[PDB]
């Protein structure tokens, strides 16, 4: 019986607090009880974990430049989009097939 | 490529959050 | 009877001062608390975005006209025609099977 911890037994040990605080990352800067669960996870994962970012190799490493391109909508595709979206909002919000 | 005033943008929004999620999770490496 | 009367003759209840810290915000909670429009289910967030865009851009009338013509209307017409000819084929099959059965019963 060398089991690590049950999928339900891992919900007490971090788990629900982790995705509770983390998904509410706006208040995650409080780090009063969040640091407890984060530290527990770090300690429990240290025996089996190994991660190294691009900080280990940076002397000759071109950087990444993220760019977002905005595209307009064509006339007949706009017609298609409006028709489909109005039909979907009329069907889903109420009785349907 | 993201179309303005469309559903796609909203979907894109979701992704970015999960990205920074990892940025406040992974802290392993060489322990002191 | 004295203790009950003494307890019932209290000093009123002046300790609360009408406490109501949030729980819950009327509309800010529903629209943004926090990100991603709590229970957004992006379809309706897209509804708000598309309605605002079409209103501000003033594209409502031609869109309404072309959707009165519509694209899915042609699909509904095609599926109606398909159902009609399928029903006709089914009727032909049923009548032919009935004729074959009556001929077979007559023969034997």
Instruction: Answer yes or no: do B28 and A68 touch at CB < 8 A.
Output: no
Angstrom distance (rounded) from CA A21 to CA A37: 10
Q: Which of A26, A81, A83 sits opposite C70 (nearest CB)?
A: A83
Question: Residue C46 class from Cβ within 10 Å (0-12 exposed, 13-18 middle, 19+ buried)?
Answer: buried
> Pick from A55, B16, A27: which is nearest to A35 by CA?
A27
Angstrom distance (rounded) from CA A7 to CA A67: 40
Token pair listed for C3: 């203790």
E strands, A1-97, in order? 70-71
Token pair listed for C28: 């800010």
Is A42 in contact with B27 (CB distance < 8 Å)?
yes
**Which residues in chain A are closer than 8 Å to C71, comparing Cβ atoms?**
79-80, 83
- C72-106: b (≥16 Cβ within 10 Å) or e: eeeeeeeeeeeeeeeeeeeeeeeeeeeeeeeeeee
Token pair listed for C94: 């049923």
Which DSSP symbol is given to A4? Answer: -
Is A58 in contact with C45 (CB distance < 8 Å)?
no
How far is the CA of C11 from the CAs of A83, C4, C7, C32, C88, in angstroms? 67, 14, 9, 43, 87
Angstrom distance (rounded) from CA B6 to CA B13: 12
Is C50 in contact with A82 (CB distance < 8 Å)?
yes
Task: For residue C38, give the H/E element and its range.
Answer: none
Q: Which chain A residue shows the shortest CA-CA distance from C42?
A: A89
Is A12 in contact with A40 (CB distance < 8 Å)?
no
Q: Which of A15, A43, A71 to mutate to test the interface with B (most CBs of B within 10 A)?
A: A71
Angstrom distance (rounded) from CA C100 to CA A25: 75
């Amino acid at each position: 019986v060398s089991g690590f911890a049950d999928l339900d037994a891992f919900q007490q040990w971090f788990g629900r607090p982790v995705d509770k605080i983390i998904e509410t990352g706006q208040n995650f800067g409080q780090d009063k009880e969040t640091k407890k669960t984060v530290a527990k996870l770090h300690q429990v994962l240290r025996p089996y974990l190994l991660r190294r970012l691009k900080a280990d190799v940076e002397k000759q490493m071109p950087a990444k430049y993220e760019h977002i391109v905005y595209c307009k909508l064509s006339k007949r595709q706009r017609f298609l989009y409006d028709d489909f979206m109005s039909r979907a909002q009329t069907k889903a919000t109420l009785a349907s097939g | 490529f993201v179309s303005e005033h469309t559903i796609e943008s909203n979907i894109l929004k979701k992704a970015n959050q999960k990205r920074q999620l990892d940025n406040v999770v992974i802290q392993e490496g060489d322990f002191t | 009877v004295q203790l009950e009367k003494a307890v019932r003759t209290k000093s009123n209840e002046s300790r609360q001062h009408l406490r109501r810290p949030l729980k819950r915000p009327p509309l800010l909670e529903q629209i943004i608390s926090g990100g991603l429009r709590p229970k957004l289910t992006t379809l309706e967030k897209s509804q708000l975005d598309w309605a605002s865009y079409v209103d501000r851009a003033g594209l409502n009338d031609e869109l309404v006209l072309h959707n009165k013509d519509g694209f899915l209307a042609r699909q509904e017409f095609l599926q109606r025609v398909g159902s009609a000819e399928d029903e006709r084929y089914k009727e032909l099959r049923r009548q032919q099977l009935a004729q074959q059965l009556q001929q077979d019963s007559e023969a034997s």
